Amino acid sequence: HHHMRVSFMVAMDENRVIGKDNNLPWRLPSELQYVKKTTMGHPLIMGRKNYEAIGRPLPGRRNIIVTRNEGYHVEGCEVAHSVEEVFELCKNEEEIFIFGGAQIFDLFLPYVDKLYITKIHHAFEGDTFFPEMDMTNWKEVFVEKGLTDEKNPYTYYYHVYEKQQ
Amino acid sequence: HHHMRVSFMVAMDENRVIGKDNNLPWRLPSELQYVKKTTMGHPLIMGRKNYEAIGRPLPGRRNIIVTRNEGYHVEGCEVAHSVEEVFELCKNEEEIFIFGGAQIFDLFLPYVDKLYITKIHHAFEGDTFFPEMDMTNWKEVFVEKGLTDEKNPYTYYYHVYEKQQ
Ligand SMILES: NC(=O)C1=CN([C@@H]2O[C@H](COP(=O)(O)OP(=O)(O)OC[C@H]3O[C@@H](n4cnc5c(N)ncnc54)[C@H](OP(=O)(O)O)[C@@H]3O)[C@@H](O)[C@H]2O)C=CC1
Ligand SMILES: NC(=O)C1=CN([C@@H]2O[C@H](COP(=O)(O)OP(=O)(O)OC[C@H]3O[C@@H](n4cnc5c(N)ncnc54)[C@H](OP(=O)(O)O)[C@@H]3O)[C@@H](O)[C@H]2O)C=CC1
Ligand SMILES: COc1cc([C@@H](O)C#Cc2c(C)nc(N)nc2N)cc(OC)c1OC
Ligand SMILES: COc1cc([C@@H](O)C#Cc2c(C)nc(N)nc2N)cc(OC)c1OC
Fold it and tell me: How far apart (Å, rounded) are the C-alpha atoms in residues B120 and B130?
């Protein structure tokens, strides 16, 4: 029914952790630069909690915030209240990026076409997790080692998976 | 249609620069010795401008120069004038290396199977760039840190990517 490509953009550790105390458990500027390059010129779909943690509209992209709050407004951002409203706002979009967090990943899980997942080889303490996924019917179309140095202190890989018809 | 493996051999910076004033923007003997090791015993496909910058046939490899000039000749080198002519000269080769520069990288881009790309972590001034590449259906099959020392003054990594069928 929807015409835009629904993509997931996420980074997670060995146990699927994505967050701790409403922020990122790791600081990886190189990973963030890859995120910015990939998502540039495409809508970002983020949960209300996810947005407030970031604190600011991310440049060069349509920021769409998902909340049940019927009176929620933020300057320089669009607000949706359901999967369908998001699909309406993004009717004509080429590809959208579901950007998190867990509640929003859950919401859009039945609709994912493509998965951009960074895997981080470390066991972080966390409270927020990326939902399990049946990877049957999925093909890995890209993999590469991320940059490890003084500023990026963990081992990590970029993966991209596409669903088959 | 063709049976030889078409490989790219290239070194570029953070902004895809490969050249400046018909020359290399950096001097990396260690990177050059990896190039010689990998390409040895395999044909080199070079654009006319790339060849003349080098100035001499590179030993142990078939040097094949790509030009539109029908009366162009160089001692100890073969001269092709098109993608297909290169394919004819290399019909029986196991693996050929597209060696640059930009115009020749463009020419053979639709045919690349394997990419040997050195990434140099520095922002050089340059005029010649390595073409953008959709890496969908490519996988990194090798990565390693290059040697940094007094003789090799930059941070750089060797990457190898293979196309998937
Ligand atoms: N490492 C990574 O790749 C990522 C990690 N994160 C991390 O995840 C955490 C945030 O994720 P999480 O706590 O799951 O929160 P979310 O980002 O999923 O936001 C939760 C909010 O989304 C709204 N919401 C949820 N379901 C619906 C619905 N069905 N209809 C309308 N609105 C809905 C609600 O807003 P409301 O209460 O206003 O009604 C809810 O409070 C942070 O720690 C963050 O750092 C986030 C993104 C990526
Ligand atoms: N960093 C790296 O990995 C590398 C860097 N380089 C750098 O790049 C620069 C050279 O690149 P660039 O300027 O693009 O030159 P090229 O090496 O790509 O050579 C261009 C020439 O190739 C010939 N040519 C182009 N298209 C065709 C075609 N379709 N059919 C037949 N012949 C064709 C033409 O020759 P003609 O005019 O004679 O007809 C043209 O002038 C230099 O600065 C060099 O140092 C080069 C290789 C690698
Ligand atoms: C709390 O602070 C942030 C939280 C997020 C989060 O929304 C995310 C993510 C995110 C990350 C990190 N990586 C990948 N591969 N996909 C994602 N979707 C982003 C940020 O910068 C942009 C943040 O500022 C520092
Ligand atoms: C004008 O000076 C040169 C220019 C080139 C260029 O053709 C190249 C390259 C090249 C390099 C450096 N690295 C990688 N990974 N791939 C390449 N294709 C080579 C040279 O030595 C052989 C040069 O002499 C010093």
Answer: 13
